[PDB]
Amino acid sequence: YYVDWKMLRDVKRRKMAYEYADERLRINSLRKNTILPKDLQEVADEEIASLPRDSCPVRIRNRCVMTSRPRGVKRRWRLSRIVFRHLADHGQLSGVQRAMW
């Protein structure tokens, strides 16, 4: 079990987005190019908008990995701010400490 249904959704999304990365890239090559004619690019356009909607990366969310919180995340530990503090304050995060200066 992932902690939340939402997290589940996200796992799927990352899987699909991993699978179609090659197709998406190859097509958006054509799409993003001035050199090729527009007639290729409109077909290529429908091509990439044909692809399953959950395969596109912008639909991914970086979520807290233990607690599933959608924001207030620190990218480095993939941790919610709350869970991060909870680990660091027991000193289970090496080299992390309160800051005085």
């Binding site: 190859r26 054509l30 190019n33 050199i35 004619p37 290729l40 077909v43």
Partner: protein
């Protein structure tokens, strides 16, 4: 350690000219494909095999549509 990358040497990485042999030589397809090529030339994360598979997907996709290319205002092989 542990990873030799198929015993490949830097010329099977940098110079991709060999796989552009079959492609229209003076067209805009040379422009596009020389860009794709140049891109793959700078790409560390991919194997030789994979780069070649990209190249071939393009071969196959352009050779898939002859029609749109001819109609486009440039006769393309």
């Amino acid at each position: 350690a542990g990873f030799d990358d198929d015993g490949s040497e830097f010329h099977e990485h940098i110079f991709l000219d060999k796989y552009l042999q079959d492609f229209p030589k003076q067209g805009p397809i040379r422009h596009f494909m020389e860009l794709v090529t140049c891109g793959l030339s700078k790409n560390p994360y991919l194997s030789v095999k994979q780069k070649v598979e990209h190249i071939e997907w393009f071969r196959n996709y352009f050779n898939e549509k002859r029609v749109i290319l001819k109609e486009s205002g440039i006769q393309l092989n």
